[PDB]
Amino acid sequence: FGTNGFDIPTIAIALLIVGVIIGLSGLILSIFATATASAISNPSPGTLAYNLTHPLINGMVSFFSFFPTLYVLLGVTGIVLIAAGIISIIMEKF
Amino acid sequence: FGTNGFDIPTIAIALLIVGVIIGLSGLILSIFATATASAISNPSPGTLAYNLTHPLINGMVSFFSFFPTLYVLLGVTGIVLIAAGIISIIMEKF
Amino acid sequence: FGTNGFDIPTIAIALLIVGVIIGLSGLILSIFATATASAISNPSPGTLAYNLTHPLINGMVSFFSFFPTLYVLLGVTGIVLIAAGIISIIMEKF
Amino acid sequence: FGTNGFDIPTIAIALLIVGVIIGLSGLILSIFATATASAISNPSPGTLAYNLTHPLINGMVSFFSFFPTLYVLLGVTGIVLIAAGIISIIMEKF
């Protein structure tokens, strides 16, 4: 059901795959982050360990704050692909 | 699901991998730094050991303060990659 | 996840390695310097042993004072590397 | 849908491409500039570091102030192109 490489069943399957992969990734990262939160303690506000450890958790927080827009762009990609498929169909189907 | 090398499943998997690696690194570095903090003591403000040891901990603090921006740039890289993928799709999908 | 040799997982791993190596070095040097401080005594201000020993500890102090800027430059190197990676991606990803 | 090289679908596609590229560029530059702002500190008004650093940020500000008119001219270019297309159509369509 298509013209050259655009196959609606294939597209649906690909959507299934990406959705399940994203769900699994979120699950694993959340479960792991819980363990991370449990492991690290809060030594004191101003001792040696604080100086040694604070920037690491800051970098953690920053990167994980960067995740959302990555996911949003990844989602946007699919609309572009489906649109290109539609246009390619229309171009030479007539 | 892609054109040449841009594969949304592959991208999601790569994001999973980098996220877990960063979490593990933060965990290990924090755990190790706790041990470092425990090991070194504070001899005295002005004796021989102070002169011998202070610059080392200063270098420690400096490098670990450099970590955050490294992480931020590493995060920025992914948006660039996804954008390049989008543009490459658009260029020859039509 | 990259183009030619720029791999975000590889970069994260390298950061892990350098961080742990630097932590270990600081630990070992501090522990050793404590023993050095314990071993050497203070004979007298003006006797033979003072003349014989003072310049050595002066050189010790100087070199260890040189360490911090070495560490700072070592930290700066990584930002340069990540930046070069970003630019290399941008150049031919489009 | 055209005469020689003027194709309305092609023009619409080109507009899509330039719009998305400009959006992505703005996004990346803003995100990067946030990190730049975070990294650099304000040492003091009159010390060595101030003398060493102030002109750099001045050049930054100047160039980024030059961006707007560049964008405006880039926008103006498209009206010229479409107009040339219209005139070329009219010249030999009759």
Next chain:
Amino acid sequence: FGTNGFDIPTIAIALLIVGVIIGLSGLILSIFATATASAISNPSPGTLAYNLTHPLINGMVSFFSFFPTLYVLLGVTGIVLIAAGIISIIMEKF
């Protein structure tokens, strides 16, 4: 989208590249200059080291004061390029 070598997407990409390069350069130079400021001390106003060191920092200050106009001219170059493109389009598009 152009006539011979003037491509609006290419121009936007080039602007992206130059902007990011300039941002990175400013970042690196500021970070490095902070370390320079930390390293050098102020011995005394009139001793040997002062005579030996003062002209070097004077040259530093001078060159870094020369940077701004370099950046301004670099910015001016792009307006010239875009203008030449516009005129080249107009000349033979009609």
Next chain:
Amino acid sequence: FGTNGFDIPTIAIALLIVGVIIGLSGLILSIFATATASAISNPSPGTLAYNLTHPLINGMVSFFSFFPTLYVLLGVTGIVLIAAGIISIIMEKF
């Protein structure tokens, strides 16, 4: 982004390189000069060692006083280069 050999990215990169090289040179020379100042002593105003040593430090002072104008001219060179680039663009872009 240029015509024959004038490339704005290349120019920005070259500016980065020269700036960092100059910073490093200043750093190294200052650090070395501190050691020089520490090493040489002041024997007496009129003894043999004074006659033997004074002209050397005089030559040191003179050459280091010559550095500043060298740096200023080196800075001036870049404005000339950028100007030549602008004129070369204008000459045959129209």
Next chain:
Amino acid sequence: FGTNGFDIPTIAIALLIVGVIIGLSGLILSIFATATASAISNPSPGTLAYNLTHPLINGMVSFFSFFPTLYVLLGVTGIVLIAAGIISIIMEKF
């Protein structure tokens, strides 16, 4: 019941095995630790035996405090394995 090496019966059996092994390990370690606690006495707070023995029990306590996160990660591993199995099934079952 599978495709290449993913067998649900085999997975269930493996879960059985790991669960029983972990239970047995906990049992044995608890029983042994009870005997350890019985054997060692508390000589005095400040005598020779205290200096000789205290760090050993401190190391005991530390390592056994490290056990929990080891177990948590070991548990996390299985979710990853099952997820990889699911994705591998989906990839080529269609």
